[PDB]
Design a protein around this ligand. Structure first.
Ligand code: K
Ligand code: K
Ligand code: K
Ligand code: K
Ligand code: K
Ligand code: K
Ligand code: K
Ligand code: K
Ligand code: K
Ligand code: K
Ligand code: K
Ligand code: MG
Ligand code: MG
Ligand code: MG
Ligand code: MG
Ligand code: MG
Ligand code: MG
Ligand code: MG
Ligand code: MG
Ligand code: MG
Ligand code: MG
Ligand code: MG
Ligand code: MG
Ligand code: MG
Ligand code: MG
Ligand code: MG
Ligand code: MG
Ligand code: MG
Ligand code: MG
Ligand code: MG
Ligand code: MG
Ligand code: MG
Ligand code: MG
Ligand code: MG
Ligand code: MG
Lengths: 48, 195, 74, 242
RNA sequence: AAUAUUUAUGU
RNA sequence: GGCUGAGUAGCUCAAUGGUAGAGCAUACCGUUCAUAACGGUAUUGUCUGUGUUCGAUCCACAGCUCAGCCACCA
RNA sequence: CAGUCGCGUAAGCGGGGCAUAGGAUCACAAGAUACAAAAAGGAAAGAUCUUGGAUUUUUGGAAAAGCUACGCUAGGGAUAA
RNA sequence: CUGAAAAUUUCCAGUGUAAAAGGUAAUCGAUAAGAUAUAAUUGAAACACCUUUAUUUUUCUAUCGUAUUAUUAAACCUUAAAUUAAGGAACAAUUGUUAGAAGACAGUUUAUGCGGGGCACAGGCCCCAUAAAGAGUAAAUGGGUGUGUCUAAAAUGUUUGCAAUUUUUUAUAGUAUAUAUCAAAUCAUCUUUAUGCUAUUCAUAGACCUUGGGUACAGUAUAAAAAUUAUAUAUGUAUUAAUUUACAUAUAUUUUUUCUAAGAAAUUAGGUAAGAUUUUGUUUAUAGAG
RNA sequence: AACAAAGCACUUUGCAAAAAGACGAUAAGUCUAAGUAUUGAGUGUGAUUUCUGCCCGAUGCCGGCUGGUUAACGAAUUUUCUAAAUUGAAAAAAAAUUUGGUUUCAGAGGAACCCCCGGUUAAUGGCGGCCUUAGCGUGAGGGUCCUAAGGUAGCGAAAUGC
RNA sequence: UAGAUGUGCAUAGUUAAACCGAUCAUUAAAAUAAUGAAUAGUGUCUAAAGUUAGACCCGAAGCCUGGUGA
RNA sequence: AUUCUAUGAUUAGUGUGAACGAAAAUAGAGCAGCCUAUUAAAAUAAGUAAAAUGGCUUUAAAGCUGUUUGAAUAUUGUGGG
């Protein structure tokens, strides 16, 4: 469909992740989220 | 092109280590400088064949002997060969200057240094075999003997040349009739298409 | 290529007794098609099955099995 | 009727391969008397890549210049570490009182002339300006040839080497017949390494793999090159000569 | 010497 | 998610790396003593975009749309 | 309440949208937790937490077309002539 | 596209049937001429030779598939107590496995709701009225162009005449205050003190001009900067050991961020801070303008 | 008025070991038949006179490509766990490679049905329109669209007619 | 004589579960920070009951298997 | 050792569900061991164990089995579980 559910992987290599949706014809998501494993805000990047 | 296609080519071209004009010159010789002309006029064919047939084999077995060749467009010139056979009685001290090969008289025969009593050789209207003969005996090289596999290499490729030429005539003849037939039919029918 | 293939029979071990041409000389051990030995050689007493007991009587081992010689001639 | 995506790849198990040293021993022999600066090595790297994919179009700056269209000559002190350094950078006939007689000969191999600021005094003493002037090769403040750093000057005037990926092979001259096994060796390392980098950043959907690399001269056979560098013949050691 | 396209109408 | 075919003028159809055509449906003219037939001409131009090549209806990629079977079908 | 980020001089505000219209389990797939490990050391297959794919649209969630005037049984007159 | 040997690539023009690219100036002719190629012409692209690659085509090898032949020369099958027979024959037949396939046959489903049933139609959720001034409240009730959506937010610094903003560092005096200093915040103001130009004046070969020097004294500010780079080439002139150097032309550049309107465009929607607070329609008037 | 029926027509059957068809938890085998294409079986029609037209697109059947697809098979691939060894690490340590066992992924080529081509109507079946006309009507006629082809001969308020 | 022997339930809770334990679970480190969970059982009789069996009683059409009859 | 009854046990476990459902062990009834079997049998077991595949049974193991294949020689560590 027009929408896809992407997964943002933690760059701390802790395995935590966030799941958001965004249109296919859009740039990959990249946000600064909170990692509960290390309890700090790190960079989360889209899996693919 | 395949891996075996090229192998059969290079291996054949790898006759640099073979029978004709192949030997390990003694440690007394350091370098050589030949000088001939471009064309073959005035007894210039001999020295050329020696450079394209036998000389390449001398470099392989003895790759530490500079063999420079000067060329000149002035035929009827000195077709000589200066063999630096001395080495100053096997003395390590090296003479700094020495030229490099080129096309137009850029590197004339350098004059021998102090410990450089050299023997020269002349070659004009003389067959390469005569030049090669005097070369080996005078230089005193020990001819290398081709091992079994080396002699096997000659036998194998010798058969390829048999089948090769046998195939050249066939594919050539198959194209002879094709090109001939296509022309005959073309000369017959299309001659009407002109109208 | 794969990790499992169709199971096949490599033949039956036999020792020649009549020096069959195109196969082997007399007293030659090798594997032959079960059909030829069963229908042609064994009835005519041209060969014999090499049973484990036969190997002991003759003193040979299982490592003496040869191969058929198609180029053999009497 | 049928078509294939990837370029044909031939099994290399049979291929007799040669080490660089052993390989040069053969190529040098064929090029026994040819001019040393007109015969140049060359490499044909076979890349396992699809037909409809992109192609490499980058450049490289080799350790030693290959193109001989611009022949450089440096007027530097004789026997000095810089005199040999000039040769490492690719200089020809460089040194003190070595070309000054060549300038008097009337035939110049070099296409350009450098004079280190230290050797500037010897230039005026030679009084060869009247000969270099008409040729348009006389150094000057505006010539940008009187420099203290030679290596920087070399990289500026020479430029870089351009290599383009054709159907299934990248072809570029890497060495000159007058190269030593050490120089030519490093020169190849910088070539295949740069390709790997570009190929690495090119794309990941279908990374291209170097299948085989062939070394050849202008008039020599194309022999498969093995990764090894040392000669297999124990008696034969690295030799350098014209 | 044995060739052969098509041509309706006119208070 | 995976793979394949595909459409050219109003209408119906050709043209495969090289001119972009044919037929028809109106219209004008010519031919004929005259009419009908016949003949000539005229436009209405490669699904869209991009890229490769001196050069693209033609080859490559993406999409529109049509079509083949697929993938999922908890 | 704890953790730690953003904006703001500050107070303070923020656990999506001014409010009211998007279905589970099971199975499967991607991560984490270190619980148990069928003799024992491992593992498999399981358990806990997070997450994704549903005209599961008969939407508290069956993979499902008709005829009988040859018709049958149990009921209803809770629906007809 | 199993590998080997050999060969094969036409628009026009072009010597002619240019596979493509990389490298190269010579290559061959047994001793004398010549063919070849670089040049020259054509073309977008130019050739020998040496390398690695592209398309296609024969034979050979290799892998598959089809067909035929032989078999008391004892597979098996058929006639036949059943054989040195006849015919068929590695097929057929049978077993296992695999795919397709006849409602021929078997099991089961085909629902329920509905002012009787059949056909049709209906099944979750949102807003309004019915609804009787809390909430709730039915009907195959009345409204609806309702809805299984959308949305990641964006494209020596400091103005040159002098303690003037906020916070902080450090130091001195000082007994907590005071001054200076440092860093940061707010802001890209552009900075050659004259090397060019302008005017005038001496000389100077020169029949108005050539060549080189001086001079100018600046608030009515000034000739004393209204915007000053760096080159590549060609053509000159004058110059030097020297395309050395200085000028004058032109034409390709970059530099001074300094001249093709994004403050002329894009309907971007959440957190927080600040700012703005009638934006629509109506109505009065207004070149083309109804 | 239904069934059968003589007649008519189509498909099938070459008999070399089983003619086809039918029966046989399933075979040997039996009927067919001590028959042989003018035989047997199956299907529709239903003596005879006069006749039986058009369409092979759809459906079914038949024939056909060294074609496409193509399960089994299979060139080329690939993975889990564990034992031992080597390398690596040699800090609290894995990890990687080879071999053994164990357990997965995987598909160039490669059958029929099917796709594709042709044939067959006494095979199952199908057998239309809209304009214009010598004056109003009526269309010999003409033009046009569509289809595999457009209901022909005959019969006709019929057992068929609201 | 002596020793042993014979289902079970309760005596401690907690969590998905083990470790743990009057404490335990969640907080990716833990720590009164909060929240949830803690105190007499067992046997027998009488009676009423849940579950599985015919399961309060009577009643189908039909389905399958083995036999009987022309 | 086998057999019979009860508990273990509406358990482990399987299965979408509905439901199906062990064994160890314990108690009791009986109790008996052997190959020289108290009636006359083995030179210690090969197309077997086992594998792939199609099924049965079942928890995936073990056991049964059509088809195609196909091992080893004893605690001095051989084979099954
Ligand atoms: K009736
Ligand atoms: K026969
Ligand atoms: K905002
Ligand atoms: K108002
Ligand atoms: K009838
Ligand atoms: K038809
Ligand atoms: K048909
Ligand atoms: K047909
Ligand atoms: K396949
Ligand atoms: K009619
Ligand atoms: K259970
Ligand atoms: Mg076999
Ligand atoms: Mg008339
Ligand atoms: Mg265990
Ligand atoms: Mg419901
Ligand atoms: Mg509800
Ligand atoms: Mg049925
Ligand atoms: Mg109310
Ligand atoms: Mg009320
Ligand atoms: Mg808003
Ligand atoms: Mg307004
Ligand atoms: Mg009749
Ligand atoms: Mg029969
Ligand atoms: Mg009738
Ligand atoms: Mg398989
Ligand atoms: Mg095929
Ligand atoms: Mg008919
Ligand atoms: Mg307890
Ligand atoms: Mg009777
Ligand atoms: Mg029991
Ligand atoms: Mg035993
Ligand atoms: Mg078994
Ligand atoms: Mg086991
Ligand atoms: Mg088992
Ligand atoms: Mg067993």
């Amino acid at each position: 469909s027009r929408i896809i559910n992407v997964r943002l992987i933690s760059m701390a290599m802790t395995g935590y992740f966030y799941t958001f949706t965004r249109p296919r014809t859009s740039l990959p998501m990249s946000m600064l989220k909170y990692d509960p494993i290390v309890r700090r805000k790190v960079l989360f990047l889209e899996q693919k | 092109v395949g891996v075996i296609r090229r192998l059969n080519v290079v291996r054949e071209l790898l006759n640099i280590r073979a029978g004709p004009g192949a030997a390990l010159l003694p440690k007394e010789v350091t370098k050589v400088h030949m000088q001939f002309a471009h064309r073959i006029e005035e007894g210039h064919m001999g020295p050329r064949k020696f450079w394209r047939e036998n000389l390449p084999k001398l470099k392989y077995w003895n790759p530490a002997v500079p063999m420079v060749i000067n060329r000149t467009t002035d035929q009827k010139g000195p077709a000589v060969m200066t063999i630096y056979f001395r080495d100053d009685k096997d003395a390590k001290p090296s003479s700094t200057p020495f030229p490099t090969s080129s096309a137009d008289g850029s590197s004339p025969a350098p004059k021998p240094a102090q410990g450089e009593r050299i023997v020269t050789i002349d070659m004009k209207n003389r067959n390469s075999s005569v030049i090669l003969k005097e070369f080996l005996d005078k230089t005193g090289a020990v001819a290398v003997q081709p091992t079994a596999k080396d002699e096997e290499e000659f036998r194998e490729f010798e058969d390829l040349h048999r089948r090769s030429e046998i195939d050249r005539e066939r594919i050539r003849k198959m194209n002879d009739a094709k090109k001939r037939e296509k022309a005959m039919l073309a000369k017959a029918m299309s001659d009407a298409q002109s109208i | 290529a794969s990790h499992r293939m169709r199971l096949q029979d490599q033949g039956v071990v036999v020792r020649l007794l009549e020096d069959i041409p195109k196969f082997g000389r007399k007293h030659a051990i090798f594997r032959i098609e079960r059909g030829r030995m069963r229908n042609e050689w064994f009835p005519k007493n041209k060969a014999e099955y090499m049973t484990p007991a036969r190997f002991q009587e003759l003193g040979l081992t299982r490592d003496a099995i040869g191969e058929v010689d198609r180029s053999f001639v009497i | 009727k049928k078509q294939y995506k990837f370029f044909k790849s031939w099994d290399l198990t049979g291929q007799q391969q040669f080490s660089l040293c052993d390989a040069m021993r053969y190529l040098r022999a064929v090029e026994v008397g040819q001019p040393p600066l007109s015969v140049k090595y060359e490499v044909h790297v076979k890349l396992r890549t699809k037909k409809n994919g992109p192609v490499v179009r980058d450049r490289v700056r080799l350790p030693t210049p290959v193109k001989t269209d611009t022949r450089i000559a440096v007027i530097c002190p004789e026997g000095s570490a810089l005199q040999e350094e000039a040769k490492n950078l690719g200089a020809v006939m460089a040194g003190e009182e070595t070309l000054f007689e060549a300038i008097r000969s009337g035939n110049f191999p070099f296409n350009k002339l450098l004079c280190h600021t230290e050797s500037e005094g010897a230039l005026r003493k030679a009084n060869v300006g009247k000969l270099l002037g008409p040729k348009g090769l006389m150094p000057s403040g505006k010539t940008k040839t009187i420099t203290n750093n030679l290596e920087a000057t070399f990289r500026d005037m020479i430029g870089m080497d351009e290599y383009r990926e054709r159907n299934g092979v990248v072809r570029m001259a890497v060495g000159q017949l007058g190269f030593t096994p050490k120089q030519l060796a490093e020169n190849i390392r910088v070539f295949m390494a740069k390709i790997k980098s570009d190929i690495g950043k090119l794309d990941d959907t279908t990374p291209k793999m170097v299948e085989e690399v062939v070394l050849s001269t202008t008039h020599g056979p194309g022999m498969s090159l093995n990764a090894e560098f040392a000669p297999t013949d124990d008696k034969i050691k690295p030799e350098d000569l014209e």
